[PDB]
Amino acid sequence: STGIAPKRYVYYPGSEELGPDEIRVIACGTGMPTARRAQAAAAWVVELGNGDKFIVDIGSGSMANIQSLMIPANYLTKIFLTHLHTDAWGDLVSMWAGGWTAGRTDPLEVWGPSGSREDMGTKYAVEHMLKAYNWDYMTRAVTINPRPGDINVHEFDYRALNEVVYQENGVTFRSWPCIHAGDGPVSFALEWNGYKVVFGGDTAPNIWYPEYAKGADLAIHECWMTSDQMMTKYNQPAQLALRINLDFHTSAQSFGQIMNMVQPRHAVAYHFFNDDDTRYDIYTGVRENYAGPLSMATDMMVWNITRDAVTERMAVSPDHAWDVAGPSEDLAPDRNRASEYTQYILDGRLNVDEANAHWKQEFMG
Amino acid sequence: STGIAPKRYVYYPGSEELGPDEIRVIACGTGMPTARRAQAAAAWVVELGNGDKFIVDIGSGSMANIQSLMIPANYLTKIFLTHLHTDAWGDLVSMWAGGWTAGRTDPLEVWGPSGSREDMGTKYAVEHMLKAYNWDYMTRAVTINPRPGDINVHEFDYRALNEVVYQENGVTFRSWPCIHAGDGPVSFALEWNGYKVVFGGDTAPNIWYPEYAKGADLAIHECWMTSDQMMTKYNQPAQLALRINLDFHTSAQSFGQIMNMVQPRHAVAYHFFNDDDTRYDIYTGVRENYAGPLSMATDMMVWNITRDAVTERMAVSPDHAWDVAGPSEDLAPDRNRASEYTQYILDGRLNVDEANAHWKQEFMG
Amino acid sequence: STGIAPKRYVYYPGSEELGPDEIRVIACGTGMPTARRAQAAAAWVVELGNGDKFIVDIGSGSMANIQSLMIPANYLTKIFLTHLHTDAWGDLVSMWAGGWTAGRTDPLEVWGPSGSREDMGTKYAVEHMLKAYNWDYMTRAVTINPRPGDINVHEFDYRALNEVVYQENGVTFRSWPCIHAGDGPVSFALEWNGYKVVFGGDTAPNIWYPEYAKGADLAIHECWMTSDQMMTKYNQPAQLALRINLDFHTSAQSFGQIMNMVQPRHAVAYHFFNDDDTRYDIYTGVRENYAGPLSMATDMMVWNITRDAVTERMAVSPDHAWDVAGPSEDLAPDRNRASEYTQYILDGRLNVDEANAHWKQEFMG
Amino acid sequence: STGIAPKRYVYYPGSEELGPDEIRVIACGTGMPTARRAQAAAAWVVELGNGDKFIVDIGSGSMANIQSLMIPANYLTKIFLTHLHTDAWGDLVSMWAGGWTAGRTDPLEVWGPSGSREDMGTKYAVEHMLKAYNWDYMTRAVTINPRPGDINVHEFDYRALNEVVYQENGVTFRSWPCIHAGDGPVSFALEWNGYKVVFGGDTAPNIWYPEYAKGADLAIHECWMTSDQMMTKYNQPAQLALRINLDFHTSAQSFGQIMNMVQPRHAVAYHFFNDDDTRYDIYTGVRENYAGPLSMATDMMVWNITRDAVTERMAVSPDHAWDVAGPSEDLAPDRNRASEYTQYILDGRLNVDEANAHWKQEFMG
Ligand SMILES: [Zn+2]
Ligand SMILES: [Zn+2]
Ligand SMILES: [Zn+2]
Ligand SMILES: [Zn+2]
């Protein structure tokens, strides 16, 4: 009566203790290159039982969903990018900037593939994102000590076949290639404490995923909208709309083929618009070849991985979100940085003393 | 009975004809550097009765709201940036890539301010952004004509006092400085067909906005959360919370003084968390010194400016947004372009012919 | 550019003219006798191209949706009830009082079935409803003309096999029995201009629906949650979950059998929780036997029925709904209506003339 | 990191153990006679540290919000009605029928006022409500035990001044007249453990509320839209728009004056449409005379009453709500009780054996 309701049928972010032998995966974006309030672009939050937390992809729009988990910014410092599509990493800037004012005190750590040359790789990309936002950076840095505005980039060969790219505190990430637009993109396997979660990213059907994702607890893979849907919605000629499901993208039928090969405890289809008139065709495509546990992902779906089961719930999270304070500590600023104001601009100040008099007076007692 | 409901109490994007002597302004972001599903970072869509349209600021998260307006990518090629904060242009990338895969045939045109030196200006910011996303650009330009993957930058002097920065088809944008983090930030005024709309951007109270926003049909200005609210939501020390409303940002009372001076037909307050326990005190603050027509901005608020009236209303728009096709032509992909695939990645294609045979044959008829 | 978007991918209620050979059906509730913000209890609004409009069912909570369609109360006076579940006609009371404050000028017309005896029928039910709300009726009628507060009831015989219960202006409703908890429940067929819409109400699988619903433009039918689901969600013993889907309700597999028999242009399944982890099994259940066009119903779904197609879309409507005014002229109150105030209560009034002095001067010019 | 985020900024229903010296109050409706997904008609949940729970009003729409709180049906048995408006008790039926099917064990208890004669009181109201829903009552009593279908009514004298109408377990409700549409409406005071909560219900300014609601921890009173907002929305003439805020309802200005008198810890305004262009004018009305803590209510607003603070939050709760089981027992049917089917109806059962055998088999194994 006055007690707490156990095993809730929805995930309320911040309301639940994580078990030492438990993973929590939250889809903070499941969408497309088209922006949509119901679906941010691809983003995954992993919370391990040992207190380690990772983001895999941080697409355009995902930061709103990520900020809604009531997780302090200092705990969301490690970011893996499958690839360098705006719809895979475009909110990294919002996580760099917003997280910093939210009181991150550590640099961002970013693991992402190379390309076929320096300027098609993750290091080039991050380096120039930081030059793009130089004004934000210098103006911020005069006051706030600049350490957390660092991004340490760990680039790995996109070509490598299931090679470790991260080994720390009992946690392994391995990568392997995808086939998606051009050379560069990868899939991630996260291994910890008996478990294995697989982040496909984006790819046409490839020989590497079905091999290295085998027997995962949670397998995530591109599952595209049908050729019929492509023709109804984007008004594509049948030949173009066919090509999209065979050459550019993993079809639902293809997705089911791969998860039949993988044999996960739980499969996840993402990277399609989950509407009242698309999802059923795509579910049917999958079920042609795969009959095991299947999630049809949308924004703020959550997976609990225990020894017993893989549980799918929806997260009920605050739309009117706020930064939530962490156990970190005020770092000691930098009184050796050059101010970015001229006196021509500071001579613009408006005398507002008389309008602010009444509230300024009550406020100081 | 069978008839369209005229002068509807909410705005349905795509449902109304825009009159030739009418302007329509929609707030696609009203929020803060903290992400929130309820409020994107700053973005304004402006629609003139002569068919000209404009985005003023395109902050982190605004793209979902902009795509909810059912406006073809080709009609939204022109972007004005008040300043180079993540939360004022972080989504220029989503508009670039998105509008390109959605059928934008023309390059993006971008106006923003210079800084005190090259690497503090818009020219440098956008140049290094295109480099940041070079993997996206080069891959996409293989399959899709590259001309609309261009961004033509129009850098204007941030120091200029109320000087034109755009003039085209009887439309003028003027700029004047803001006082905000460091040199470069501006406010804009759009002058067309007897009308004046002011976009304040981000600023502590300054002597220029009161002078140059005078007699505006719609006046927009930063209006910050109360010091008491700074000390409650974030747990600041009194001093730091006082300084924020007296030095770093415009207080409600300040906003009130400025709009008192400006005597706009209609004034808009934005850039605070519009919540059921914040908005009222901020409202009371404005009303200390300003008694005129006022909107307290939140996401998808819209203003109709006619000779007779300045109407405020809410837009009711699809969360499940799709791109909408515009009048323009198919453009031809440049075939003198090297693949970004090596044979090593392409040798990974999976045989999926069988799994896909069922739907495949049915679709070719 | 300044024009309307044609054939929009979502329905904006109030924004689209109905053709003279066109029907529009909006699901205003698709849920259970359990309350849910995301699904109201059963309710349908039918709009014919000839100007006539009808509600079939008005279950608990449906009114907030019906009010969102921006339809004047004076156009929504004709209500047919499939049966007498709270979850089938619970919001009749809200349509009765709400419509009347908001300027309905004609009486409500209700068609509902008889039962096995007097006190199991719509006549008894509505006579005693009006008694329950006698305080509301008498207090409202001092001030507003009592005529719109009349309910004319049209009790049809629940036993009749596919017999006319309404025939006016080229429109026909037939009824036939359901098997649902107790004698009384019916399904209806609306016939107009060569269109046939079937409102299944609630039923266990019966021999009448497949016969009388055959060749429907749009066929609607109960489609219950699976026996696995009933156990998972509600904590059921194995053999009671089995009984729900074979005796009490129409299983998804049965729904497929019926719609296989009916061969409609479009079948609609409804009266199940449409959730991210219920919908897909239900859909696969139907698909075992029925292959034709299907909608899995949710709240605010809309079908456009033309000669050429049956289109499913989602309605996008104001959560902040208001009454909308219809042309219908003024209606003169009574001065043969006793006040319901005694002077004991009326002597309780508070002097507030001075607290209201400021805005009461300002307002009288 | 693996911890639970404490003293959280949103209330997640089901997630917070209630303190023994604490009251929790949720607005489950705040609306008008007009239906709206944003605002249910008036409803209030009170939870007490002794584990007693209470509903005060249960207006049309409210049940969807009540069910979102994840409270078992069996702990929600006691309803107090301020008055007999459809928008104050229209969803009692929904709590009656819906609780019962979800394992409520005890009858509902209902406390409402009498009127000037039997047919204007709560005993008469509820008696005829049960007759109205006789079919539903009689059919449900065949397959589930009939006792939780009962509604034990406690009618009290509306005219009484501050008299005890409930007295159990250290909890005490008092009532006093309102002036609302006609004789019969009241306000409640809930007194428990040195806390006073006051439920305004609906009234024009009266001499009883200020007297009897003095020293209230939480104090709730009608507060109406402005005359200007009445003229603009409902196309009123000038004089009738004036009569509404002086005679029939309590103005913002009068809400101020009355709350100035009562000097509660925390004042609540409700019964106005809480919209981005209405609420502000209403805030400013109330602050002409009241400067104490003030909530402008909307659906799912919650107050925590502790010794130290009256804390406002917003509840973030599932739209896709479900019943949660309580510790109550599995109560048993009745064979005595006569079936409500005739052989005429059962003779209509369709044979669906072949359709259902495949799922029927796998369920039993
Ligand atoms: Zn991609
Ligand atoms: Zn800024
Ligand atoms: Zn029923
Ligand atoms: Zn009332």
Numbering used by the authors:
A (entry chain D), B (entry chain A), C (entry chain B), D (entry chain C): 9 to 373
From the paper:
PNGM-1 is derived from a metagenomic library from deep-sea sediments that predate the antibiotic era. PNGM-1 has both MBL and tRNase Z activities and is considered to be the evolutionary origin of B3 MBLs. The wild-type of PNGM-1 has two MBSs in its substrate-binding pocket, and each is occupied by a zinc ion. The zinc ion in the first MBS (Zn1) is coordinated by the residues His91, His93, His188, and Asp210; the zinc ion in the second MBS (Zn2), by Asp95, His96, His279, and Asp210.
His91 and His93 coordinate the zinc ion at Zn1, whereas His96 and His279 coordinate that at Zn2. In the crystal structures of the H96A and H279A variants, the electron density of the zinc ion at Zn2 is markedly lower compared to that in the wild-type structure, indicating that either a water molecule with full occupancy or a zinc ion with half occupancy is present in this site. In H96A, even though electron density exists for the zinc ion at Zn2, the density is weak and noisy, implying weak binding of the metal ion. Among all the variants, H91A and H96A exhibit the lowest metal occupancy. From a structural viewpoint, the substitution of His91 and His96 by alanine markedly weakens the metal binding affinity for Zn1 and Zn2, respectively, compared to that of the wild-type and the remaining variants. The residues His91 and His96 are buried in the substrate-binding pocket of PNGM-1. In the structures of all PNGM-1 variants, except in that of H96A, the electron density corresponding to the catalytic water remains despite the complete or partial loss of a zinc ion. Each MBS of PNGM-1 is formed by four metal-coordinating residues, and the substitution of only one of these residues dramatically reduces the metal binding affinity of the enzyme.
